[PDB]
Every structure is written in C-alpha cells, then in structure tokens.
C-alpha cells in the first residue's frame, strides 16, 4: 500500500487503478466466495470408507442433498456433468475393491 501511495501521490493513476482492475483478483475472489461454502464440508469421506452398499445408498443421497445448494451459486452445465462422471468414477473404484 505504501508503494501504491507513492504512485498515487506522484499523480500516476495507471498502476494504482490497474492494481485492482487489471488484476482479476477481485472477480476471482468473488467467484471463489460464491463457491466457498459449497467447497467447505464436502461429504466425500462418506463415500471413502463405504464398503457396504447400504452405506453407499445413504452416502449417495447425502452427498447429492448437500450438493443441492448449486441452485443459488450458478453452477455450470458441463462442469456439473463432468462432476457427476467423477462421482461415478469413485463409485466404480469403491465397487471394484468391494467386488
């Protein structure tokens, strides 16, 4: 901020305004904050140590009900579809060792 004050006090507005506008940190942080509660406390561990299919039943329903908060956070289409296939990837891995 002291360097920014140097450039502001020296009437050079370029680097000062670009320090917040040219840097995409502001929009990156706001999208991060939009996805911030969605990424904290994710029940993937419910899927990790689940060897019994009943644990997997309740686990699958639990993870998707926690994922239900993407209605308010603008989730993308293709991102959600690759997400679903990733969920099925770990489902398949768990079932492979289960068999």
């Amino acid at each position: 901020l002291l360097t920014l004050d140097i450039l502001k006090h020296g009437k050079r507005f370029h680097a000062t305004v670009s320090f917040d506008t040219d840097t995409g940190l502001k929009q990156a942080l706001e999208t991060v904050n939009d996805y911030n509660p969605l990424m904290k406390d994710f029940p993937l561990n419910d899927l990790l140590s689940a060897t019994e299919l009943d644990k997997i039943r309740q686990a699958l329903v639990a993870i998707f009900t926690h994922l239900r908060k993407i209605r308010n956070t603008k989730y993308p289409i293709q991102r959600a579809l690759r997400l679903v296939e990733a969920i099925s990837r770990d489902l398949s891995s768990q079932l492979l060792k289960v068999l």
Partner: protein, 188 residues
Amino acid sequence: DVSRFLRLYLRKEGYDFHSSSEFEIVKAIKERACYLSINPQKDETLETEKAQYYLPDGSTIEIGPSRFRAPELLFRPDLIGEESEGIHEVLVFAIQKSDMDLRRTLFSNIVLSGGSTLFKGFGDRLLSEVKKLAPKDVKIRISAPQERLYSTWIGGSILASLDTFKKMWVSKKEYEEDGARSIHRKTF
C-alpha cells in the same frame, strides 16, 4: 518562416545574418524585439524610436521598421509572395466552412496555442481582424492561456493519463499484424 522573413528585412536594414548558427540569433530577435502594430499601415507611415539590440557578440543593432512588419507576414502572406491567407482568414474560413448552427458557439470560443501567438499585440490585432470578417453583432471571444507553448503537451498529459487510453492506442502486436493500415484505421 516569420524569422526567415525577418532575416530578409534585417539584410535590408544593413545588418547581415546568414550563418546557420546565426539564424538562431534572428529567432532570438523575433522572440524579444518584435511586436504587432494595431493599425498595419498608420504605423508604417511613421518613424519609430528604433530601439537597439545587444547581440551575443556584444554589438548593437538598431532595428527600426523591421520589427513590426516582420510578424505582419502572418496576416498577409503577400509580403512573402504567396496566395495563402492570413491567420484571421484561416479562422473565419474554418468557422464558415462548418454547420451554420455552430458559428455563434465557435465565435464565442477561440483558443490560441503555439509559440507564434506570443507576439505583443497579437490577440488584440486578431480581434480587430476577426471583427472585420465576422458578421455584425456576434460575440467574438478569443482566449489565450498562459501555456500556449505547452498547450499540446498538457493536453497530451490529460489525454494519455486516462483509462480509455488503453483502448485508444495501437498495440505493437496489432501493428505487426495489420501494419500501417491499422494506424490509419485507428487514427482517431
């Protein structure tokens, strides 16, 4: 060119200055010993006080009539022998070759810039000339800021210091892509 014509008049006075590094002395004389007569002819029909001038060498030059007729060239390029126009005619033609709905606004806002607008009695003579060419009872207004030498530079400092200048320039990449046509395209 006013300095060049002044050099010719100095030769006609008797004082010769023809060296390339002496033409600069002629410029110095133009910058500190010339003025603009209000009446262009009434003052020519009189003998002035003929003030002196000290050269860098230490000599002395009495100028005489070669000090007001020298910047007279700007208002009459007949002295240099040319069919061009004076400054006043450049203003009046620039205003009259525009939309008739803006003439009064343009006559109420004239800005001078450039170092040649620093002669004594320049603005006053310009007002007289424009009044002779503008239509009757139209407020003529000539401004003359104190930074006529620095007008274009200060304007550049204001223009380039804006955030829109990023979109107003021509990038190097763009110049390498299109070429000079990109400059003529985005010339404004």
